[PDB]
């Protein structure tokens, strides 16, 4: 079992744990309460495996999607912070971490894709993804591209097909309607359409995945791409002059990338529940102490309000979290599997010709409303 009178986080060890080590250590000079971070290898496959036999870390840190299934299995106490608390992030933050009407998870972090440009190719980047075509005949007689992004994931392509209607589950009253999907709609079709139009006009490749889009831009081969954060290193040893900015709109209305929320849980098992709360509400979430975490390794957005609005000072934050805001929080249910399956093969199979946008997408919503 989980010894008393201490606390032992896990966090994936390519995360700021370092930082959350040295907040650690501060809470031990003020408590007396001593720390441990560890990140096991598979940690997050781990944890449901300890905590079944009331064992493992006090405080786990991961994506909030996966901590449905935490939650399913009683691995995760409930949270129970005060109004007072809940209003110093970010309220979107706290339906990620719901789970049954049940807080169950502190969020920490904010990631989703952006838009990322070429400054050198494109001072001003388009607001419109109709400029596309244009954009990109313009570009091409220059012997460049206007737009590469990975075409092979839901998570890359669904901000265009959501624009216009499209949406995974229905949420309403905190909870997901798995009944309601949103994925054969008019508002999905005319955004898959307007994707396979521009694969039709050459403007994007059927074929273009992760590897060939980031090669292309890190290469100043092509204007613009869709990425998240975890690219930006790459962009900055590529030396080019990059942006990041809002997603296009489309029909007037703005993409609505899918938002993953870096969320810190605490252990049913954990006989340190009230130093655990402690620790994280008044110690971590904190500017002192998320500015430690992300000084470590960049968290890209935060759930703090007072923090995001310091770091948002670079542009870059400031659009991560703006596309965050206008995207669609990842349902923390199991028929995701399901969705995400099911579109990934009907962009492909409409992108390739071998389905039309209609039935790709009708057979995506028949097999997820199974
Ligand atoms: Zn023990
Ligand atoms: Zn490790
Ligand atoms: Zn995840
Ligand atoms: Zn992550």
Same mark, same amino acid.
């Given at each position: 079992?989980?010894?008393?009178? #201490?606390?032992?986080?896990?966090?994936?060890?390519? !995360?700021?744990? *370092?930082?959350?080590?040295?907040?650690?250590? #501060?809470?031990?000079?003020?408590?007396?309460?001593?720390?441990?971070?560890? +990140?096991?290898?598979?940690?997050?496959?781990?944890?449901?495996? &300890?905590?079944?036999?009331?064992?493992?870390?006090?405080?786990?840190?991961? +994506? +909030?999607?996966?901590?449905?299934?935490?939650?399913?299995?009683?691995?995760?106490?409930?949270?129970?912070?005060?109004?007072?608390?809940?209003?110093?992030?970010?309220?979107?933050?706290?339906?990620? &971490?719901?789970?049954?009407?049940?807080? $169950?998870?502190?969020?920490?972090?904010? %990631?989703?894709?952006?838009?990322?440009?070429? #400054?050198?190719?494109?001072?001003?980047?388009?607001?419109?993804?109709?400029? $596309?075509?244009?954009?990109?005949?313009?570009?091409?007689?220059?012997?460049?591209? @206007?737009? %590469?992004?990975?075409?092979?994931?839901?998570?890359?392509?669904?901000?265009? $097909?959501?624009?216009?209607?499209?949406?995974?589950?229905?949420?309403?009253?905190?909870?997901?309607?798995?009944?309601?999907?949103?994925?054969?709609?008019?508002?999905?079709?005319?955004?898959?359409?307007?994707?396979?139009?521009?694969?039709?006009?050459? +403007?994007?490749?059927?074929?273009?995945?992760?590897?060939?889009?980031?090669?292309?831009?890190? !290469?100043?081969?092509?204007?613009?791409? $869709? /990425?998240?954060?975890? @690219?930006?290193?790459?962009?900055?040893?590529?030396? &080019?002059?990059?942006?990041?900015?809002?997603?296009?709109?489309?029909?007037?209305?703005?993409? !609505?990338?899918?938002?993953?929320?870096?969320?810190?849980?605490?252990?049913?098992?954990?006989?340190?529940?009230?130093?655990?709360?402690?620790?994280?509400?008044?110690?971590?979430?904190?500017?002192?102490?998320?500015?430690?975490?992300?000084?470590?390794?960049?968290?890209?957005?935060?759930?703090?309000?007072?923090?995001?609005?310091?770091?948002?000072?670079?542009?870059?934050?400031?659009?991560?979290?703006? *596309? @965050?805001?206008?995207?669609?929080? %990842?349902?923390?249910?199991?028929? %995701?599997?399901?969705?995400?399956?099911?579109?990934?093969?009907?962009?492909? /199979?409409?992108?390739?010709?071998?389905?039309?946008?209609?039935?790709?997408?009708?057979?995506?919503?028949?097999?997820?409303?199974?």
């Amino acid at each position: 079992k989980i010894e008393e009178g #201490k606390l032992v986080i896990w966090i994936n060890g390519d !995360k700021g744990y *370092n930082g959350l080590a040295e907040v650690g250590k #501060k809470f031990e000079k003020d408590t007396g309460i001593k720390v441990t971070v560890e +990140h096991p290898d598979k940690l997050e496959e781990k944890f449901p495996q &300890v905590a079944a036999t009331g064992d493992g870390p006090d405080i786990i840190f991961w +994506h +909030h999607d996966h901590f449905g299934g935490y939650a399913q299995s009683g691995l995760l106490a409930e949270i129970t912070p005060d109004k007072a608390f809940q209003d110093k992030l970010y309220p979107f933050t706290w339906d990620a &971490v719901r789970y049954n009407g049940k807080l $169950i998870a502190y969020p920490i972090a904010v %990631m989703a894709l952006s838009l990322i440009y070429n #400054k050198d190719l494109l001072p001003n980047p388009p607001k419109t993804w109709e400029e $596309i075509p244009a954009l990109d005949k313009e570009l091409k007689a220059k012997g460049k591209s @206007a737009l %590469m992004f990975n075409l092979q994931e839901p998570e890359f392509t669904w901000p265009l $097909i959501a624009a216009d209607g499209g949406y995974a589950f229905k949420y309403e009253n905190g909870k997901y309607d798995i009944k309601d999907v949103g994925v054969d709609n008019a508002g999905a079709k005319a955004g898959l359409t307007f994707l396979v139009d521009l694969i039709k006009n050459k +403007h994007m490749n059927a074929d273009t995945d992760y590897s060939i889009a980031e090669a292309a831009f890190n !290469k100043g081969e092509t204007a613009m791409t $869709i /990425n998240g954060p975890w @690219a930006w290193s790459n962009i900055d040893t590529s030396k &080019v002059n990059y942006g990041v900015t809002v997603l296009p709109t489309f029909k007037g209305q703005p993409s !609505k990338p899918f938002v993953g929320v870096l969320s810190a849980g605490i252990n049913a098992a954990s006989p340190n529940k009230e130093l655990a709360k402690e620790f994280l509400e008044n110690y971590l979430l904190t500017d002192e102490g998320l500015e430690a975490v992300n000084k470590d390794k960049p968290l890209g957005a935060v759930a703090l309000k007072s923090y995001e609005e310091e770091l948002a000072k670079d542009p870059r934050i400031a659009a991560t979290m703006e *596309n @965050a805001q206008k995207g669609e929080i %990842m349902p923390n249910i199991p028929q %995701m599997s399901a969705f995400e399956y099911a579109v990934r093969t009907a962009v492909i /199979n409409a992108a390739s010709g071998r389905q039309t946008v209609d039935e790709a997408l009708k057979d995506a919503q028949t097999r997820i409303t199974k």
